[PDB]
Amino acid sequence: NLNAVRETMDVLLEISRILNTGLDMETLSICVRLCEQGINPEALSSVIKELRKATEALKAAENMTS
Amino acid sequence: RATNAQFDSPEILRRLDVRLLEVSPGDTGWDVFSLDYHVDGPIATVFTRECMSHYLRVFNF
Amino acid sequence: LECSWDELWNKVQQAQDLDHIIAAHEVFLDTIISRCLLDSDSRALLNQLRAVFDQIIELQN
Amino acid sequence: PPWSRLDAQQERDVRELVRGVAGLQDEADPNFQLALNFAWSNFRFHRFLDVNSHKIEKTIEGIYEKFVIHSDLSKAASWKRLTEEFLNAPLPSIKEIKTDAHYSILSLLLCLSDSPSNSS
C-alpha cells in the first residue's frame, strides 16, 4: 500500500531527525531500497560515512581555498 | 576513590555506577553520562521502572 | 533531587504498608522528575534547560 | 542476466547515494568514480553480519534512555515510536513487516545517529 510505504519513509526520516543523522528523505529512501536489495547495512553505512567524510573534507578544502 | 564517595558502604557504592548511553559521533559526555540505581525485588515495587527512569533523568541532568 | 529523595526515604520509613511505600516513592519520584524537569509535562522546560546547558558548554569551550 | 541487472542497480543506487551525499554530480569526476567503486566494493565484498533486529531495537532503546536521562522525554518517546513504527512498517521493495530491510534501515540510522539525547 502506497500510503504504508509513505508512512514508512516518514518514520525513517523522523528517526533520522531524532538521531540528527542529517539524512534527507531521498537518501534515506535510497538506503532503504539498497537494504531491501540485500546490501549489508554495515557496508551501506560505511559507504555513506566514507562519502560524507569525503564531502566534508572537500567542503573544508574549498572553504580554505575560497 | 578520589572523593568522599570512597567512604560509602560497599553495598551502596556497588549500586552507584556510570552508565554510558549509545555513543553517537559528535555527542559529548554531557549527553550520554548518567548515574543509575538498580531496583529489584520488593524495593522495585516502590522504586518502579518509572521511578528509576525519573531518578536516572535527574542524575543525568 | 535531594529534597525529593529525602522525602521518599522519610515516607518509606513512615510507610505502614507496602502499597503505601510504593505510592509514596512513586509520588516522590514524580515530584523529583517534575521539579528537575524530567517529567512528561516539564519536557519543554527540560529542553530549554538543555539548550541553556549546551550554550553554556559552547561558551565554556 | 538478472544477476547483472541486480548488480547494476546496486551500483546505480550507490552512485546516486554518492551524488546526493558527496555532491559529486559529475560521474566523470575521478572522486565520483572512486566513491562509486568503493561503494560497490563494500557492497559486494563486505564482511559484515546480517542485520540483527534485536541489535537495532537495543540501539533504539538506548537512544530512548539517553533522551529520557537528558530529560528529553519527548525526544525519547518520538524515537521509540518512530523506530517501532519503522520496524512494523513495510519497506518500498518489501511488503512484509519486521523484515531484514527494516532492521538494516534501523541499523543505518543508529550508525548515522548524532547525539540523539541532545537533539531537539
Swiss-Prot record, chain A:
Record GO biological process: gamma-tubulin complex localization; microtubule nucleation by interphase microtubule organizing center; mitotic spindle assembly
Location of this chain's protein in the cell: Cytoplasm, Cytoskeleton, Microtubule organizing center, Centrosome; Cytoplasm, Cytoskeleton, Spindle
Endpoints of the signal sequence: none
Entry's Gene Ontology cellular component terms: centrosome; cytosol; gamma-tubulin ring complex; interphase microtubule organizing center; spindle
The entry's keywords: Acetylation, Cytoplasm, Cytoskeleton
Main location: cytoplasm
Family: Belongs to the MOZART1 family.
Cited function: Required for the recruitment and the assembly of the gamma-tubulin ring complex (gTuRC) at the centrosome. The gTuRC regulates the minus-end nucleation of alpha-beta tubulin heterodimers that grow into microtubule protafilaments, a critical step in centrosome duplication and spindle formation.
Subunit-structure text: Associates with the gamma-tubulin ring complex (gTuRC) consisting of TUBGCP2, TUBGCP3, TUBGCP4, TUBGCP5 and TUBGCP6 and gamma-tubulin TUBG1 or TUBG2; within the complex, interacts with TUBGCP3 and TUBGCP6 to form a luminal bridge with actin that stabilizes the initial structure during complex assembly. Interacts with TUBG1.
Name of this chain's protein: Mitotic-spindle organizing protein 1
Origin species: Homo sapiens (Human)
Lineage: Eukaryota, Metazoa, Chordata, Craniata, Vertebrata
Curated annotation (Swiss-Prot), chain C:
Subcellular location: Cytoplasm, Cytoskeleton, Microtubule organizing center, Centrosome
Superkingdom field: Eukaryota
Tissue specificity annotation: Ubiquitously expressed.
Subunit structure: Component of the gamma-tubulin ring complex (gTuRC) consisting of TUBGCP2, TUBGCP3, TUBGCP4, TUBGCP5 and TUBGCP6 and gamma-tubulin TUBG1 or TUBG2. TUBGCP2, TUBGCP3, TUBGCP4, TUBGCP5 and TUBGCP6 assemble in a 5:5:2:1:1 stoichiometry; each is associated with a gamma-tubulin, thereby arranging 14 gamma-tubulins in a helical manner. Gamma-tubulin at the first position is blocked by TUBGCP3 at the last position, allowing 13 protafilaments to grow into a microtubule.
Family: Belongs to the TUBGCP family.
Known role: Component of the gamma-tubulin ring complex (gTuRC) which mediates microtubule nucleation. The gTuRC regulates the minus-end nucleation of alpha-beta tubulin heterodimers that grow into microtubule protafilaments, a critical step in centrosome duplication and spindle formation.
Protein name in UniProt: Gamma-tubulin complex component 3
Species, as recorded: Homo sapiens (Human)
Lineage: Eukaryota, Metazoa, Chordata, Craniata, Vertebrata
Residues of the full protein shown: 727 to 787 of 907
Curated annotation (Swiss-Prot), chain D:
Name under which the protein is recorded: Gamma-tubulin complex component 5
Subunit record text: Component of the gamma-tubulin ring complex (gTuRC) consisting of TUBGCP2, TUBGCP3, TUBGCP4, TUBGCP5 and TUBGCP6 and gamma-tubulin TUBG1 or TUBG2. TUBGCP2, TUBGCP3, TUBGCP4, TUBGCP5 and TUBGCP6 assemble in a 5:5:2:1:1 stoichiometry; each is associated with a gamma-tubulin, thereby arranging 14 gamma-tubulins in a helical manner. Gamma-tubulin at the first position is blocked by TUBGCP3 at the last position, allowing 13 protafilaments to grow into a microtubule.
Protein purpose: Component of the gamma-tubulin ring complex (gTuRC) which mediates microtubule nucleation. The gTuRC regulates the minus-end nucleation of alpha-beta tubulin heterodimers that grow into microtubule protafilaments, a critical step in centrosome duplication and spindle formation.
Tissues where this protein is expressed: Widely expressed, with highest levels in heart and skeletal muscle and moderate levels in brain.
Family: Belongs to the TUBGCP family.
Compartments where found: Cytoplasm, Cytoskeleton, Microtubule organizing center, Centrosome
